[PDB]
Each structure stands twice: as structure tokens, then as C-alpha cells.
């Protein structure tokens, strides 16, 4: 009895994630694609990258 | 993402972000002081922000302390 | 055909409708507890919760037994 | 209507609300205090209100496991 | 999916995934400290988050025995 | 109209007859310590209000049950 | 399997309805025991040993229920 | 008499996983009690000590949960 | 040979941390015993000793919480 | 009753894999290949090989 | 001769430990007692005094650890 | 010789394992009580109470873990 099994794949990744948090003064700020924002002076952003 | 923090780190902040520059200006005042050791000026300067840290700190640790005795007792109820 | 439901169908469903939302209640106020594991408002909702859960799955499951073991002994006498 | 609440339930919520704003006053102090450490008026009030907040606590969650015994030394007797 | 899991792991898991990255902070805060043992602000880091740890775990082990005793009360009804 | 009453309801009413204001009395004492918890002489007297209350409910099922069984296996030997 | 009963196939549907935790809290076992002081090590054991417990139990009964039903209904061939 | 039960199995893995604990709790011990004011001995001391406590414990109960898994299915024979 | 668990592993974290101070001390008392009037030595050993003082506490700490954590999970197993 | 077993077999890993990340300007994390927050803030690389 | 436990061994073995330290101790007392003001005795005394100390209270902590590592597994023989 | 039960000779295996500590046990007291405030027969006491401890618990879990045994044997004679 003869049985055989063949197999191939291919995958590929690639590209960047951005969000982040803005402060202007004490009374305003934004968050952005971020369930809140940084308790945090200025501005502050990330961008995750896969490749 | 975020820098993940909890309960109690939030309550240790809430003292770092009430005294402004406190830290700073407490290594000003000694590098100055250390320039000059002998200048009654900068002693009674020195003085009042060492004291000044000194208190920050203690208070600091002993809230911390209770926060978390107050969770531990509770977390023990719940078998 | 409509799902056939016998009695102690009917004498178990009493109590999942008798609690209207206790059974998602106890699933959000999880979610909230271990998204910030350390606040005691927190746990001392998810304490009351879980209680009352416990509690109502033994009185269920309990009176669904009692009931099977009358049905059970009736049966005997038929021979 | 309002979210189902049991026994338990209406037992935890009678002390939230007993203090009817210590969970704010303590807040409050806490900001004030941590505005500035070294103030021996505001050290002397923000005592007494964590002192009242750990008692307060403590006592719900006793008394809560407390009625949670109860019922299951009756429950257990129905089989 | 995932290699396999009952409700308990999941209720694990729960946790392990609401303190997103306390463990490796905690880990990593450690290898700080421990390289100048005497700095006062890498000192009350460590302590507040070694106290988050501390009550994650407990609440953590805690829940996963109440969930083993309302199953077990549960199963033994069967016979 | 009113209730009938079997053998084991007079068992159980003698209980509730017996004690006759402390369903009661264990409220008020729980509604006044709630609105003033840090006073230790609502304290003292809860703690004994609230034991006497589990000795009284867990007595009660106690006995019920074991003329649950008497009564149970006289009938038996009818067959 | 040579011959399998009703009752067999029930315990089956337990056995291959978990798939794979028989092994996994054999490796658990191991691993703690080389570090018996790490809490994840610990944490992962307390679970994957619960659920056993639990596996094996809801199997046994079962399989009792199921025998006093047939024995019951053979009786009364007679 | 080689003969050893799943339980002593589960007890052994512990025994062959702390392979040298078993007498470094000694050699502490004895260089200690020669010098006992020393923290560079107290400090090691303190480290072994513990992890042959935490050791004992999950030792015994592990071999105890397994006894109350056997016995319930034991009981359903009948 | 060696066995090593995480308990002694976060003590030798300390041990690493503090490349040299363990010697460091021992020199410097060395030195202020040959002449204990030297201002200089005075100030110098004071740094250290005080410097030991912390790392030593600061380590037993350590070790004793992250053991109540863990028996704090075994009591669980039952 | 003669049972003969016979086996070969034959191996080989070589190669190496990356990750780190960055920052800048106190406005932008970069992370390449983590999970991670980048929590350091500041710059770090990790390679592993194999060989 | 008499019989004597494994706590018995281990306390014994501080005893023998600190070979002599009780007697250095007890003369000690004495000649600083006939001159109370001779600082050579007082800078003598407070050395065996603190080793004392230390002694005894190790000894101690050591005996409580092990009798608790043992009512624990006697509490899992139910 | 009375009759004595296999549960008596189990009991009494221990009694005779610790030929003297029932006694040491007491003699120590009498003593202590003449001076409570003498470390040296306080670091003893502390040893031999420990050592009566866990031999009266040892006893009885025993006791109770062979009552069980036969009970469970003999209710299947019927």
C-alpha cells in the first residue's frame, strides 16, 4: 500500500500600525486609535512595524 | 501600546506629578552647594529642599503601604 | 417541532429567568477586575457577585435532584 | 428593571450608601495633600480619612462573607 | 484556538492578559535596581510594582478554586 | 385561606416564636453601624446580634432535617 | 478497538473530546518539578490539574448512570 | 521490593528534580552553625531554606489530590 | 552538580549587581585599621559600610516576599 | 525469527533572526519584530543565531 | 544515650557549633564585673555578648521552621 | 496480657518508638519552672514540647486513616 502526502505554503507580512496620544495645555487633549489619552505632556505616538 | 499601570503606580504618580521639579531642583541646590560649602546662603537653601524630599518620599512609601494592605485583606475573602 | 421541555425542565429554567442579568453581570464585572486588578471598589463588587452566583447554582442544581428522586420512587409502585 | 440585585447585594449597597461621600472626601484630601507634602494641617486630616476608608472596607467584606455562610449551611441541607 | 482549553484556563488567561505586560516590567525593573541598590527613585519603582504583582497573583489562584468548587458541587448531583 | 401548616412548620415556628425580636433587632443594628462604622460600641453589640443570628437559622435546619428522616423511614416499611 | 460497547463509546466522547490535556499535565508535572519556586510554573500546574480532576470525574459518573438504566430495563425481561 | 505505585512515581519526580537540595540544606547548615554571625553565610542560608520549604509542600499535595482522584472513581465499582 | 532554583537565582541577581563592593569593604576596613585618625579613610568607609548595609537589606526583603507568593499558590492545590 | 530495524536520518539549522526598536525625540517609539512596548526608551537591537 | 528527634540534632548542632561561647560568656561577666571601668573589658564583653545574642536567636528561628514544614505534611494524612 | 487490637498495636508502635520523651517532656518543665528566665533551659524546652507535638498528632492521623480502612472492608461482607 502506497500513501503519499505533498505539501506546499507561502505567507507573507508586512507594514506599520499607528496611535497615539496629544495634550494642549491642562484642559484639551486626543487620543487617537487609543482607548485614552496619556496623562502625558506634548505628544506621543507609536508605529508598530512588521515585516 | 501603552505602558500598562495599575491601581497603586497611579496613586506613586499623583505625588511625582504634584511636586513640579522638586527632584531637579534638589540636585541644583547641591551642585551649587558643592561648589561653595562654606556660603550660609546656599546651607539654609540646601536645608529646606533636603527636608523637603525627605518628607516627599515618606509619605510616598507609607500610602503605597496601606493601599495595598487595604486590597490584600479583601483579595483573602473571597474563598 | 418547538424544543420539547419536560418538569424539571421548567422547575430548572425558573431560576435562569428568575436571574435576570447575574449571569452576564458576573461576566463584565471580570473583565473589569482583572483589567485593573488592585482597585477596591472593584473587588468589592466582584466579591457580592460571585457570592450571589454560588449561591444560585447549588439551590439549583439541589432542587432539581430532590424533584427527580420523588419521580423516581412513584415509579417503583407501578409494578 | 434597575440591574438585578440580590440579599447580598442590597447588604454591600447599604454601606456605600452609609458613608455617603468619604469616597470623594478621600480623593479630595489625597490632591490636597499631595499638592503640598509638607503641610501639617493637611497630614492631620488626610489620617483620620484613610483611617475611616480602611475600617469602612473591612467591615463590608467581613459582614458579606459572613452572609454568605449562612445560606450555604441551609442550602446544603435541602438534599 | 489554542492548543487546548477548559473555562478554568480561560479564567486564567483573563488575567494574564488584563496586566498586558506587568511581568516583564516587573522583570526588567529588578535588573535596574539591583545595579545600584541605593537610588531612591528606582527603589519606590520596584516596590510599587512588586506590589501589583503580589495582589495579581493571589486574586488570580484565588478565583480558580472558587470555580473548581462550584463545579465539583455540580457534578456530584449526578449520581 | 391561612396557611395549612404540616408537623415540620410547627418545628420551625417554634424557632421563629422563640426568638421573638431579633429578625429585627439584627437590621436596626446593621442600619446604624452602617451609618457610623468606626464606633466600637455599635461594633460590640453587631457582633453578638449577628452570631446569635447564625446559631439560631443553623439549629433550626439542623433539627428539621432529622425529622425529615424519622419520618421517612417509618414510611418505608409500609411496602 | 476490537469490540466497543455503548458504554465504551461514552467514555470515548469524553477522551477524545479533550484533546490533548493527558499529555499536557504530564509536561506541567516535569516542568514544575525543575523550578518548584516560579509562580507561572505554579499558576500553569494549579489549572491544567483542576481540569483533570474535573474530566475525570464527570467521566465516572456517567458511565454509572447509564448502567442502572440498562440494569433496570433487563429486570424485567422476567 | 522495586516496587513503586503511580503515587510514588508522581513523589519521585520531585526527589530527582532537586537533585542536590537534599544536602546543600545540610552543608549550609553545618558551615553556618560553625560561624553564626557571618551574613554571607546567613544570606545563602535564608535561599536554601526556603526552596526546601516550598519543595516539602508541593510534594505533599500533589500526592494527596491525586489519592481523592482515585478514590471517587473506586467508589463507582459498585 | 549545581542546582540552583529561582529564589537563589534572585539573590544571585544582588550578588552580580554589586561587582565588587563584597571586597571593596573588606580593603577599606583593612586600610582604616593601619591609621584610624585619616579623615580620609574615615569618609571612605563610611560609603561603604553604609553601601553593604543597604545591599544586604534590601536582598533578604526580596527573597521573603517572593516566598510568601509562592506558598500563597501551593495552599491553593487542595 | 530474524526483526531488523534500520535508520538514518540527517539535520541542519543555520541562520539568525532580528528585533529591537527606537526612539526619537521623546515623540516616536519604533519597534520591529516585538510584541513589546518598547519600553525602554531607548534605542536597543537584539540578533539570534544558529548555527 | 536518652533519646533525642531531629529537632533535638538540630538545635544540638549549634551547641557544639559555638564550642565554647557559653563559658567565654560567663567568664566574661565575671572579670568585667570585679572592674567595671576598664575599657579593654567592656571592648571584650560586647563582642561575646552580641555573638550570644545571635546565637540564640538563630537557634530559635531554625527549630520553628522545621517543626512547621512538618505539621504540614502530617495535616495531608486524612 | 489483655486483649489488645491491631489498632493497639499500631498506637502503641509509637509509645515504644519514643522509649523517654514522655518523661524528658515533664522534667524539663519542673526545671524551667525554677528559673523561667534562663535561656539555656528555654532553648531546650522549645525542643522537646516541638518533638511532643508531633508525635501525639502523628498518632492519632494514623489511628483514624487504619479505622477507616477496615470499616470500608467490612461493610461489603453483606
Known sequence: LWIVDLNKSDLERLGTSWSGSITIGDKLGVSLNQSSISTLDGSRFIAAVNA | ?79
Chains 1, 10 share one sequence.
Do not use: H
Open chain 2, 1 to 79: 501600546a501603552t505602558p500598562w499601570s495599575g491601581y497603586l503606580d497611579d496613586v506613586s504618580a499623583k505625588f511625582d506629578t504634584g511636586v513640579d521639579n522638586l527632584q531637579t531642583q534638589v540636585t541644583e541646590a547641591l551642585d551649587k552647594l558643592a561648589a561653595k560649602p562654606s556660603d550660609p546662603a546656599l546651607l539654609a537653601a540646601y536645608q529646606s529642599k533636603l527636608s523637603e524630599y525627605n518628607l516627599y518620599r515618606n509619605a510616598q512609601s507609607n500610602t503605597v503601604k496601606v493601599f495595598k494592605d487595604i486590597d490584600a485583606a479583601i483579595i483573602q475573602n473571597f474563598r
